[PDB]
Amino acid sequence: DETIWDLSPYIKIFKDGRVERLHNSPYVPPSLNDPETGVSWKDVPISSQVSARVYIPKISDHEKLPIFVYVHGAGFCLESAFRSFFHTFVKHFVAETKVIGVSIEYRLAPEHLLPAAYEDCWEALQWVASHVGLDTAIDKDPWIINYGDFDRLYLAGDSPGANIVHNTLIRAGKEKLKGGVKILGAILYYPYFIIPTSTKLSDDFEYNYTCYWKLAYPNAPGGMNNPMINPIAENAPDLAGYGCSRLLVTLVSMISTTPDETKDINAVYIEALEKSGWKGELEVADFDADYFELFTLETEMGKNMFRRLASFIK
Amino acid sequence: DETIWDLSPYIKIFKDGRVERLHNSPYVPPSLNDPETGVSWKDVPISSQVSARVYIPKISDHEKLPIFVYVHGAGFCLESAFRSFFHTFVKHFVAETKVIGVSIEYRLAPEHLLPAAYEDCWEALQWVASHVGLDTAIDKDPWIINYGDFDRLYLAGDSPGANIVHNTLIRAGKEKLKGGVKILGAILYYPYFIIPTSTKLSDDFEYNYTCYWKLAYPNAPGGMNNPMINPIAENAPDLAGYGCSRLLVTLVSMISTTPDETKDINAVYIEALEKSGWKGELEVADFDADYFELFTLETEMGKNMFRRLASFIK
Ligand SMILES: CCC1=C[C@H]2C[C@@H](C(=O)OC)C3=Nc4ccccc4C3CC[N+](=C1)C2
């Protein structure tokens, strides 16, 4: 039948409400002592609507590890913490950086429009924070209680996930987290913002980039000038409020074989943060690379970007 | 392309190795305090190849609950502990009986031929047993440690799942479980055995019943007289060895709108158990009912069978 959004080969949204997910990587079940990596993972409930895949690496000491909270991307509308595309990345990252991984399973558009994802990821972060100083209720993860170092909490995301992390950092700034937990550092791989710049995006890229915000938040107050998509809008929260001490922004130049056009947008964002009076450590990493190579880890450039993100965790 | 097995609408196995399962029930993610039932569930690893959905109901006292280990059926080759068909059943059963649920995610044929499922379910049962007297390593479930009553352990399955439970009971008999854990009671809902009787199965029913054993264990030693499918074969293990004190066998008369033909097979099985010198409590429940009604819970006969299984747990 007719479609509203034909975003082949990623997603089709039909006039009749049907959603075909063309890029849906297979489910990967929980595993103990993964042969390749020694990582173990489990899928745990946070609420009746929010869950997470929790990861622990091969253990040596009693020693506590940084906590790496990941928010997957893909259009606000695709994939899962539980499917191989993002799971394979987080698994390898956990093995390499020796962290407790918490990959959030948040509700996807169009079935659950924004701000569902924002609410879910905030609820999940507060859930992580709620374990501080518990050395237990049925919802509490013993991996986080026993091995999570709340002095080294990181929050990371890609594409719309990085947009969620942005909005979560603003919120962590205004509201604070349970137990006085502070986010030490955050990572945005391929930020997802929409900002008017002096050079217009090309017609095709504008359509295939802005569509995700349009289908995920059709009734957004201010549309693509909503502060949650445009972080320098008239009514936007002060970036000085960002609730982390360290921030890594990683930029790429290609979406598969398509030239990316977010250079100007991300430049305005970074200039705004630097001009804000946020007195944190800013790290930018700008690669001639495909967005996808970070996750697949088949190419040298993919491995370089992986190692750059790994270096941000100490 | 050409197929080896066309079991539309459930599974197609192609000459070129491809496996289509088009009508698999949807995945249902972990949830805390389910609005309908108050049950919570999580997906936890047992090994690098075996996982389980663990269920806990709304909690009142500190009081310990029976442990209900479930082994889903569907052809040795379909569905999942994590998909709605079996999950919805186990969820409702947990709410009604107030038990710790452990629904085993075992490897499916044809990707993992038998005896993979048997090995996986044995490993899962030993994993459950390994929690006895722990009031902990990263693989141990705090729900089982805190709320699991090892004096009231039940092992239950349907269709090929019931075949797995049969073979697991024989094994529990020969090998014993960690910590001296004994299975108190077991349930076979719609047993899956192949036994020669005096009345031949009809052509169509024989094909659509035996196909699951043939595709799951091609060239099993003895074929359909393999002791693991035919529990009264010449070389079959003694049924006196069954490692439970109580057994419920529940029989039905219909597969959807198709007359079932396992009455004679299940009669031979039950007569053999009764003649074995197994000194346990045997319960048989024979309904004029559709196999499917237990899981869907839409009909009065479905609710009757549900309540019969619930009565077996005390
Ligand atoms: C033309 C802009 C564009 C962006 C890229 C980054 C990001 C995304 O959603 O960006 C907004 C995605 N991550 C995925 C991971 C897996 C399947 C799809 C995606 C997308 C959407 C498709 N895409 C096109 C990729």
Ligand SMILES: CCC1=C[C@H]2C[C@@H](C(=O)OC)C3=Nc4ccccc4C3CC[N+](=C1)C2
């Ligand atoms: C005509 C014989 C026959 C048996 C029935 C019982 C059982 C099964 O595998 O029994 C052998 C199934 N449970 C399912 C649950 C969900 C999808 C399919 C099944 C099957 C296979 C289809 N079928 C055919 C149902």
